[PDB]
Amino acid sequence: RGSHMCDAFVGTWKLVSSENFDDYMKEVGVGFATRKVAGMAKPNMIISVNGDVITIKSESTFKNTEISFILGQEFDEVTADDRKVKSTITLDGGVLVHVQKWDGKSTTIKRKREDDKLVVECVMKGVTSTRVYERA
Numbered sequence: 692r693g694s695h696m697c698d699a700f701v702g703t704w705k706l707v708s709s710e711n712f713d714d715y716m717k718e719v720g721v722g723f724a725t726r727k728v729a730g731m732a733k734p735n736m737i738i739s740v741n742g743d744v745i746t747i748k749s750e751s752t753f754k755n756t757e758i759s760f761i762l763g764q765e766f767d768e769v770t771a772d773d774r775k776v777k778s779t780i781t782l783d784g785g786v787l788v789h790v791q792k793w794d795g796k797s798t799t800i801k802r803k804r805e806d807d808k809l810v811v812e813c814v815m816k817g818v819t820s821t822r823v824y825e826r827a
């Protein structure tokens with residue numbers, strides 16, 4: 692009912708820069724055609740909070756996806772590249788930390804506020820991709 696910690700994430704955000712995303716997708720195991728088309732996308736990310744439930748939507752020409760979750764509570768996620776993963780998202784000192792597990796593999800996506808930006812760091816096996824979003 693009062694202000695939530697994650698309120699700083701709430702809003703509509705647009706992708707403005709990406710680094711190393713193709714390499715990150717390769718490490719995750721994303722196939723050629725999906726990497727090419729997904730790498731071209733300039734998504735909007737819409738984040739909202741309602742009680743304990745955080746919703747993150749990604750809208751792009753490639754795919755529209757949405758996840759809703761409670762911090763610390765594992766859920767099923769079908770990713771944009773059609774991985775069926777088990778996901779858990781927590782808040783660690785202001786940073787949303789999203790761990791995806793599938794097929795004995797794991798990747799971590801961190802989302803944080805930096806100045807007026809929302810910075811998304813995707814990490815797989817030593818490869819990091821940084822994606823920067825600004826308010827739409």
Ligand SMILES: CCCCCCCCCCCCCCCC(=O)O
Nearest residue numbers: 729732734749751770771772811822
């Ligand atoms: C981010 C949506 C468009 C690109 C879809 C990428 C599909 C393959 C990789 C899935 C990992 C998703 C990484 C999230 C990064 C982000 O939201 O910008």
